[PDB]
RNA sequence: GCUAAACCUAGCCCCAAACCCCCACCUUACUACCAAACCUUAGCCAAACCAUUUACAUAAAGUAUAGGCGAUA
RNA sequence: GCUACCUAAGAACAGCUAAGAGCACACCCGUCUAUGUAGCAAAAUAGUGGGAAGAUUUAUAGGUAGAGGCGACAAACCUA
RNA sequence: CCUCCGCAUAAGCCUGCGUCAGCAACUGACAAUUAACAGCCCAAUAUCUACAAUCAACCAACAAGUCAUUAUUACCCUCACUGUCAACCCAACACAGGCAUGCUCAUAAGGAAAGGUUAAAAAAAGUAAAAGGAACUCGGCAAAUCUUACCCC
């Protein structure tokens, strides 16, 4: 019977967070601090996707020749193996043409 | 099992080598096992200045009153089993022999005035001080069921009671507690139960014979 | 089939529960009929001393005081049983001093370790 | 556990209604 | 499991609450139940 | 010694010392019947049957004359929750027969009957573990289970 | 009459599958490199 | 005797049998080594005795009459173990400057990982020793694939500890 | 003992221990806010006071503290009633058994004000590490617990098997450049006129 | 009212950073000790068969070129 | 480690009649029938039958490996 | 009342009906298998080894065979280590199966086909049968009794 039977413990979610009052900041550093940065420059994460938006082929495709010298040994088998993959899929599967 | 000899006698003969191991904690009790002298119904001032070498502020004139709203208050949380406030007013001595076998029924004690006022009887002495007081008052009872009929004793009319409740009080926090209620051997027999008893007798196996 | 179990002696046939044995040290050594000459000299003899009188009883008794632990260094080592022999000898060749380089000709060799415990 | 609130709500007043049709009060 | 359906119980009562007067494992059994409560409206 | 590694002997060397004895030792109960003149003892596994009799005559000296060895296989036949086999240890049993018609009897350790009876005051606790369990004022049946606190 | 195709030796379990038949090639230390890197409990017989 | 093996019969079943302390290794490093070679053969002597006690305890169904001093003999006879090590290799930092006893030497065997090769008494040299020349020191160019796999493998143990490690740190400051 | 063991009441290798923790259960941890090893202040022996809950108000002594868990047991206070010596017929008898205090819900008490105070780790001239509370710079000192064992250190007779004072401090050692193996051969007397041919180690 | 139900923290995933780690054991591994490594990947699959062929920072650019000039590269 | 063949060094074969002889045990094989068919058995049991001093059966250790091995060719057998 | 089994060794397995305790051999504690039997051997360098076995004697062979030292040098010590249990192994099982050798060739050893009742059908295994004797059937398969004769390959 899957529905628990006590309501869970209250969420509380401060509004006011370091994180939360701050959000935002320093995102039109361009267009009013005289284009010394890019906004894509304030984005922190992976290095092939700081500042770039791609599907799944494309992803895995700038993620082994971004940092793929550097990945691990069957962490790049199962890249390649998903590049093998995404490759049959997009090319040759699909109902649209 | 039945004793603790038939237990390390069978922790022994299946093999069970339990180590008996030393801990820094102790059980801390609060009160004793029984009566240090046994008063027997039908001098003792040195105990007295054992107690007020402890205590420092304690009249023996002023303790029948003070025994009494022990005694009434610790029979009145019999009513309604509030054991929080048993715990404060009866010894751990006096409350599994006051409420173990008044669990799952309901009595419905009622205190009346008394007839004779109380005096103290004789007074002994991790010290425990220890009073005897004399009580003949005028209670009645009425115990009944899980059912709610009655098993023990008409609601109505008051009954005379003679009792020697005996008091201890631990010697930094502890206050004066009921610790047992002495029965004399020439007391009268209680009040009959309102059902009938059978007593089975020798339950006999096929050999044996009665004799 | 096993796998997990310990491979003891007590498990393969005939010729292999004889060759290997627990972990006891050789003695001798076998000759024509599978005859045993046991070397006197491999066995090792117990040097054991004389407790006679002796007063060091197996526990120290409760009133006894305390101390920090100084492990023997060996700077510690040097200090105290060459360095006086040394000052006695400065104020007035060092295998005088205890100092020995080569330990072909002696029994009990420290480097590699030619005695045993 | 499947995470959220508003599931566990509507349980918890639906055994208020049984607890009222199983023990209907005075 | 990132959002799986934590409200599932109330959508088999919605069809089990009609067929609370059937025969058999159809007032009680959810598979057996929609196949006769579409058939009863 | 044991764990150790030994100095190997060339054929015209110093003869091999001990002088820290590694190992233990400990006799024990023979589980059947035996000889007036056999010790048993648990030897370690890496002590020889001529390193036992070096052992006894010098340590304790007693005069053995005939050392006679066996392993003893610990059962692999029991499992923890996790299934997995718990192996009780080998241990190398060793029957010792003492010299000069000499006879060994176990002693009895742990004598059964201590003085005469059960117990009281072994170290406040025990007391009350006792003094109610002859104070229990058993139910009378005459009563009918009615509680017999109130003097009524 | 199949299923009895285990017949136990001690001798001829050593000879083939043992540790030191699996060291002797060089394609046998692979097949003790790949329990090593699964983590098995026993790398040969 | 045979009486060595047990203490004195006025302690035979009295289920509590009092003992000292253990000696501490700082109480050891005043005595000399004819001391500590006279004094182990005193504590060997009594750790036969409690380890015959021990086994005579369990034969019997029931608990020692002091387990805490055997544990004490036990004690007393690391520490002495453990002076006479430190005398041992203190004297061997002055007379040959070695570090550990036994000679040795870092290799790398078939599986490629670096071992503490512990050498072995021989009696003729290594270029002739027929079964030491079977020993293969080295490894080959097919096991440099399983030692990046098994390096990748204990940096991914390594990076799920640590990982794990500040979300429980993140647990406590959010708790307190 | 396993890891994310579950400390409790009673000392973790205890029968009463072992039914409570057998070697299976996968319990919740128990969240406790890191002390430092140096940051503890509570000992075996304090005089301290309860705030929260039953006998709030009241100061006892500490028996007990599982430093695992950041509790301190004070004695007779924040107790519960159970029954020991339970048997097949006979009911037990009744002893208060007390519960354990987190550090946060018991504070300090200065031996001269009766207060609960706060405590500062304030190294001294004289003393290295010494409790000093915060309402008054009085010294708090690590009192006398009762021991480890049944020692007594006080009241310690030998028996035939200790040995004394005297000969556990007689320094006897003459150091020199000869080993335990070489100092006895000249104390017994054994003689080798064999020398130790030279093996290869490799 | 039985069987059961429910639970939340074990742990994990993805990134960023920072380049990781006494004794016995290659003979029958866990056994104290005796007279020689390097040499193209292939094929599925795509071509609707198959046979040449078929992928393994941004921008120039899917451009020049290649190709049963065809799939595609 | 079953099995096909080989190698090494072993072993086994009563009794009766007189040679890859006959009758016949142990042994090996499996003609025919019946039971069994989630069975005792992922090929067995009971009766019957073929050989049983040989091109026999068999214990042990070794050898040949899948683009192959082995094969008194059944395109058999090579861990159901 | 059954026994075409049993008892040892080999191989295998590895404490698996010993003590104590908890349809009508499992868990926990404790205890045992003691070497003479069997494994574990051999100092070099040369140099010796044509005539089987079969009661080995007659005979009779072909397939042509399982068995041996000396010379000189070196050498003088001794009894360590390991196996030793069981109702057991391989068959997923306490499986009518599989399993080498030595003795006993019916037992001195080892065992129990029936939980209790009733006495249906059908089914399985067996015994008996009037008169007939293959008319049965693809076929004398099966059973019961023993033989003749001829073809095909
Ligand atoms: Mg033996
Ligand atoms: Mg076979
Ligand atoms: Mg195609
Ligand atoms: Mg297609
Ligand atoms: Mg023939
Ligand atoms: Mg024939
Ligand atoms: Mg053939
Ligand atoms: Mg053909
Ligand atoms: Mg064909
Ligand atoms: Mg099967
Ligand atoms: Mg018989
Ligand atoms: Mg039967
Ligand atoms: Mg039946
Ligand atoms: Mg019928
Ligand atoms: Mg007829
Ligand atoms: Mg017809
Ligand atoms: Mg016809
Ligand atoms: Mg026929």
Same mark, same amino acid.
């Given at each position: 019977?899957?529905?628990?039977?006590?309501?869970?413990?209250?969420?509380?979610?401060?509004?006011?967070?370091?994180?939360?009052?701050?959000?935002?900041?320093?995102?039109?550093?361009?267009?009013?601090?005289?284009?010394?940065?890019?906004?894509?420059?304030?984005?922190?994460?992976?290095?092939?996707?700081?500042?770039?938006?791609?599907?799944?082929?494309?992803?895995?495709?700038?993620?082994?020749?971004?940092?793929?010298?550097?990945?691990?040994?069957?962490?790049?088998?199962?890249?390649?193996?998903?590049?093998?993959?995404?490759?049959?899929?997009?090319?040759?599967?699909?109902?649209?043409? | 099992?039945?004793?603790?000899?038939?237990?390390?006698?069978?922790?022994?003969?299946?093999?069970?080598?339990?180590?008996?191991?030393?801990?820094?904690?102790?059980?801390?009790?609060?009160?004793?096992?029984?009566?240090?002298?046994?008063?027997?119904?039908?001098?003792?001032?040195?105990?007295?200045?054992?107690?007020?070498?402890?205590?420092?502020?304690?009249?023996?004139?002023?303790?029948?009153?003070?025994?009494?709203?022990?005694?009434?208050?610790?029979?009145?949380?019999?009513?309604?089993?509030?054991?929080?406030?048993?715990?404060?007013?009866?010894?751990?001595?006096?409350?599994?022999?006051?409420?173990?076998?008044?669990?799952?029924?309901?009595?419905?004690?009622?205190?009346?005035?008394?007839?004779?006022?109380?005096?103290?009887?004789?007074?002994?002495?991790?010290?425990?001080?220890?009073?005897?007081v004399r009580m003949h008052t005028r209670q009645t009872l009425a115990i009944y069921d899980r059912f709610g009929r009655l098993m023990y004793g008409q609601e109505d009319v008051?009954?005379?009671?003679?009792?020697?409740?005996?008091?201890?009080?631990?010697?930094?926090?502890?206050?004066?507690?009921?610790?047992?209620?002495?029965?004399?051997?020439?007391?009268?027999?209680?009040?009959?139960?309102?059902?009938?008893?059978?007593?089975?007798?020798?339950?006999?196996?096929?050999?044996?014979?009665?004799? | 089939?096993?796998?997990?179990?310990?491979?003891?002696?007590?498990?393969?046939?005939?010729?292999?529960?004889?060759?290997?044995?627990?972990?006891?040290?050789?003695?001798?050594?076998?000759?024509?009929?599978?005859?045993?000459?046991?070397?006197?000299?491999?066995?090792?003899?117990?040097?054991?001393?004389?407790?006679?009188?002796?007063?060091?009883?197996?526990?120290?008794?409760?009133?006894?005081?305390?101390?920090?632990?100084?492990?023997?260094?060996?700077?510690?080592?040097?200090?105290?049983?060459?360095?006086?022999?040394?000052?006695?000898?400065?104020?007035?060749?060092?295998?005088?001093?205890?100092?020995?380089?080569?330990?072909?000709?002696?029994?009990?060799?420290?480097?590699?370790?030619?005695?045993?415990? | 556990?499947?995470?959220?609130?508003?599931?566990?709500?509507?349980?918890?007043?639906?055994?208020?209604?049984?607890?009222?049709?199983?023990?209907?009060?005075? | 499991?990132?959002?799986?359906?934590?409200?599932?119980?109330?959508?088999?009562?919605?069809?089990?609450?009609?067929?609370?007067?059937?025969?058999?494992?159809?007032?009680?059994?959810?598979?057996?139940?929609?196949?006769?409560?579409?058939?009863?409206? | 010694?044991?764990?150790?590694?030994?100095?190997?002997?060339?054929?015209?060397?110093?003869?091999? &010392? /001990?002088?820290?004895? @590694?190992?233990?030792?400990?006799?024990?109960?023979?589980? +059947? !019947?035996?000889?007036?003149?056999? =010790? %048993?003892?648990?030897?370690?596994?890496?002590?020889? &049957? /001529?390193?036992?009799? @070096?052992?006894?005559?010098?340590?304790?000296?007693?005069? +053995? !004359?005939?050392?006679?060895?066996? =392993? %003893?296989?610990?059962?692999?036949?029991?499992?923890?929750?996790?299934?997995?086999?718990?192996?009780?240890?080998?241990?190398?049993?060793?029957? +010792?027969?003492?010299?000069?018609?000499?006879?060994?009897?176990?002693?009895?350790?742990?004598?059964?009957?201590?003085?005469?009876?059960?117990?009281?005051?072994?170290?406040?606790?025990?007391?009350?573990?006792?003094?109610?369990?002859?104070?229990?004022?058993?139910?009378?049946?005459?009563?009918?289970?009615?509680?017999?606190?109130?003097?009524? | 009459?199949?299923?009895?195709?285990?017949?136990?030796?001690?001798?001829?379990?050593?000879?083939?599958?043992?540790?030191?038949?699996?060291?002797?090639?060089?394609?046998?230390?692979?097949?003790?490199?790949?329990?090593?890197?699964?983590?098995?409990?026993?790398?040969?017989? | 005797?045979?009486?060595?093996?047990?203490?004195?019969?006025?302690?035979?079943?009295?289920?509590?049998?009092?003992?000292?302390?253990?000696?501490?290794?700082?109480?050891?490093?005043?005595?000399?080594?004819?001391?500590?070679?006279?004094?182990?053969?005193?504590?060997?002597?009594?750790?036969?005795?409690?380890?015959?006690?021990?086994?005579?305890?369990?034969?019997?169904?029931?608990?020692?009459?002091?387990?805490?001093?055997?544990?004490?003999?036990?004690?007393?006879?690391?520490?002495?173990?453990?002076?006479?090590?430190?005398?041992?290799?203190?004297?061997?930092?002055?007379?040959?400057?070695?570090?550990?006893?036994?000679?040795?030497?870092?290799?790398?065997?078939?599986?490629?990982?670096?071992?503490?090769?512990?050498?072995?008494?021989?009696?003729?040299?290594?270029?002739?020793?027929?079964?030491?020349?079977?020993?293969?020191?080295?490894?080959?160019?097919?096991?440099?694939?399983?030692?990046?796999?098994?390096?990748?493998?204990?940096?991914?143990?390594?990076?799920?500890?640590?990982?794990?490690?500040?979300?429980?740190?993140?647990?406590?400051?959010?708790?307190? | 003992?396993?890891?994310?063991?579950?400390?409790?009441?009673?000392?973790?290798?205890?029968?009463?221990?072992?039914?409570?923790?057998?070697?299976?259960?996968?319990?919740?941890?128990?969240?406790?806010?890191?002390?430092?090893?140096?940051?503890?202040?509570?000992?075996?022996?304090?005089?301290?006071?309860?705030?929260?809950?039953?006998?709030?108000?009241?100061?006892?002594?500490?028996?007990?503290?599982?430093?695992?868990?950041?509790?301190?047991?004070?004695?007779?206070?924040?107790?519960?009633?159970?029954?020991?010596?339970?048997?097949?017929?006979?009911?037990?008898?009744?002893?208060?058994?007390?519960?354990?205090?987190?550090?946060?819900?018991?504070?300090?008490?200065?031996?001269?004000?009766?207060?609960?105070?706060?405590?500062?780790?304030?190294?001294?001239?004289?003393?290295?590490?010494?409790?000093?509370?915060?309402?008054?710079?009085?010294?708090?000192?690590?009192?006398?617990?009762?021991?480890?064992?049944?020692?007594?250190?006080?009241?310690?007779?030998?028996?035939?098997?200790?040995?004394?004072?005297?000969?556990?401090?007689?320094?006897?050692?003459?150091?020199?450049?000869?080993?335990?193996?070489?100092?006895?051969?000249?104390?017994?007397?054994?003689?080798?006129?064999?020398?130790?041919?030279?093996?290869?180690?490799?």
């Amino acid at each position: 019977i899957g529905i628990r039977l006590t309501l869970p413990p209250p969420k509380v979610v401060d509004r006011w967070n370091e994180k939360r009052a701050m959000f935002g900041v320093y995102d039109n550093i361009g267009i009013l601090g005289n284009f010394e940065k890019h906004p894509k420059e304030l984005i922190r994460g992976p290095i092939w996707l700081r500042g770039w938006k791609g599907n799944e082929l494309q992803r895995c495709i700038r993620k082994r020749k971004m940092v793929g010298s550097r990945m691990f040994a069957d962490d790049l088998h199962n890249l390649n193996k998903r590049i093998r993959y995404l490759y049959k899929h997009f090319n040759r599967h699909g109902k649209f043409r | 099992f039945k004793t603790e000899k038939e237990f390390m006698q069978h922790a022994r003969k299946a093999g069970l080598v339990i180590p008996p191991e030393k801990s820094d904690r102790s059980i801390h009790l609060a009160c004793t096992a029984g009566i240090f002298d046994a008063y027997v119904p039908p001098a003792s001032q040195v105990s007295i200045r054992r107690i007020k070498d402890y205590d420092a502020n304690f009249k023996i004139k002023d303790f029948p009153e003070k025994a009494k709203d022990i005694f009434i208050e610790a029979h009145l949380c019999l009513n309604n089993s509030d054991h929080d406030r048993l715990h404060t007013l009866v010894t751990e001595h006096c409350f599994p022999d006051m409420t173990w076998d008044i669990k799952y029924k309901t009595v419905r004690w009622s205190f009346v005035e008394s007839l004779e006022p109380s005096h103290v009887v004789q007074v002994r002495c991790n010290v425990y001080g220890q009073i005897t007081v004399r009580m003949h008052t005028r209670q009645t009872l009425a115990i009944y069921d899980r059912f709610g009929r009655l098993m023990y004793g008409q609601e109505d009319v008051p009954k005379d009671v003679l009792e020697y409740v005996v008091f201890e009080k631990q010697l930094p926090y502890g206050s004066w507690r009921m610790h047992t209620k002495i029965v004399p051997p020439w007391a009268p027999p209680k009040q009959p139960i309102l059902k009938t008893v059978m007593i089975p007798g020798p339950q006999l196996k096929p050999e044996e014979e009665y004799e | 089939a096993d796998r997990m179990s310990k491979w003891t002696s007590k498990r393969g046939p005939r010729s292999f529960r004889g060759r290997k044995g627990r972990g006891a040290k050789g003695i001798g050594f076998l000759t024509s009929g599978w005859r045993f000459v046991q070397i006197k000299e491999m066995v090792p003899e117990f040097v054991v001393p004389d407790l006679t009188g002796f007063k060091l009883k197996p526990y120290v008794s409760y009133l006894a005081p305390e101390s920090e632990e100084t492990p023997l260094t060996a700077a510690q080592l040097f200090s105290e049983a060459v360095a006086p022999a040394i000052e006695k000898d400065f104020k007035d060749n060092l295998e005088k001093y205890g100092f020995e380089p080569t330990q072909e000709g002696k029994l009990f060799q420290l480097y590699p370790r030619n005695f045993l415990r | 556990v499947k995470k959220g609130f508003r599931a566990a709500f509507r349980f918890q007043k639906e055994l208020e209604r049984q607890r009222l049709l199983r023990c209907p009060p005075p | 499991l990132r959002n799986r359906v934590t409200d599932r119980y109330f959508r088999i009562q919605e069809v089990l609450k009609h067929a609370r007067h059937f025969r058999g494992r159809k007032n009680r059994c959810y598979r057996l139940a929609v196949r006769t409560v579409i058939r009863a409206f | 010694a044991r764990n150790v590694v030994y100095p190997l002997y060339r054929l015209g060397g110093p003869q091999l &010392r /001990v002088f820290r004895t @590694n190992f233990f030792i400990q006799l024990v109960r023979p589980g +059947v !019947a035996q000889p007036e003149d056999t =010790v %048993q003892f648990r030897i370690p596994m890496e002590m020889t &049957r /001529v390193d036992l009799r @070096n052992y006894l005559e010098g340590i304790y000296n007693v005069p +053995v !004359a005939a050392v006679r060895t066996r =392993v %003893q296989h610990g059962s692999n036949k029991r499992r923890d929750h996790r299934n997995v086999r718990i192996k009780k240890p080998d241990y190398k049993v060793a029957y +010792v027969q003492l010299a000069h018609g000499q006879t060994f009897t176990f002693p009895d350790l742990f004598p059964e009957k201590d003085e005469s009876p059960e117990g009281s005051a072994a170290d406040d606790l025990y007391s009350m573990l006792e003094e109610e369990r002859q104070q229990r004022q058993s139910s009378d049946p005459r009563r009918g289970g009615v509680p017999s606190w109130f003097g009524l | 009459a199949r299923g009895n195709e285990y017949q136990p030796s001690n001798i001829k379990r050593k000879n083939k599958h043992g540790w030191v038949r699996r060291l002797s090639t060089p394609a046998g230390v692979q097949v003790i490199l790949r329990r090593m890197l699964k983590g098995r409990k026993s790398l040969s017989h | 005797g045979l009486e060595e093996f047990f203490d004195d019969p006025k302690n035979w079943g009295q289920e509590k049998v009092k003992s000292g302390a253990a000696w501490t290794c700082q109480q050891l490093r005043n005595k000399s080594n004819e001391d500590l070679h006279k004094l182990w053969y005193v504590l060997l002597k009594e750790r036969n005795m409690l380890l015959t006690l021990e086994q005579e305890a369990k034969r019997q169904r029931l608990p020692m009459p002091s387990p805490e001093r055997l544990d004490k003999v036990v004690d007393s006879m690391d520490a002495l173990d453990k002076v006479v090590q430190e005398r041992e290799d203190a004297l061997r930092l002055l007379q040959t400057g070695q570090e550990r006893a036994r000679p040795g030497a870092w290799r790398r065997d078939i599986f490629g990982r670096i071992i503490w090769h512990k050498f072995k008494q021989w009696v003729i040299p290594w270029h002739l020793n027929k079964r030491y020349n079977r020993k293969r020191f080295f490894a080959l160019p097919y096991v440099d694939h399983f030692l990046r796999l098994e390096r990748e493998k204990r940096a991914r143990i390594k990076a799920r500890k640590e990982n794990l490690e500040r979300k429980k740190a993140k647990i406590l400051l959010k708790k307190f | 003992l396993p890891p994310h063991y579950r400390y409790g009441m009673s000392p973790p290798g205890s029968v009463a221990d072992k039914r409570k923790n057998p070697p299976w259960i996968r319990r919740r941890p128990v969240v406790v806010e890191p002390i430092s090893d140096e940051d503890w202040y509570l000992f075996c022996g304090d005089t301290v006071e309860i705030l929260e809950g039953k006998d709030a108000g009241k100061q006892g002594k500490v028996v007990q503290v599982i430093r695992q868990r950041n509790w301190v047991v004070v004695g007779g206070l924040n107790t519960h009633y159970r029954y020991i010596g339970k048997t097949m017929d006979y009911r037990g008898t009744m002893i208060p058994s007390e519960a354990p205090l987190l550090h946060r819900q018991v504070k300090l008490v200065d031996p001269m004000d009766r207060k609960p105070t706060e405590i500062e780790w304030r190294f001294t001239e004289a003393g290295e590490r010494v409790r000093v509370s915060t309402r008054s710079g009085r010294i708090i000192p690590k009192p006398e617990f009762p021991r480890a064992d049944g020692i007594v250190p006080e009241t310690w007779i030998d028996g035939p098997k200790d040995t004394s004072v005297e000969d556990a401090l007689e320094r006897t050692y003459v150091p020199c450049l000869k080993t335990l193996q070489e100092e006895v051969m000249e104390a017994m007397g054994i003689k080798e006129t064999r020398k130790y041919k030279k093996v290869y180690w490799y």
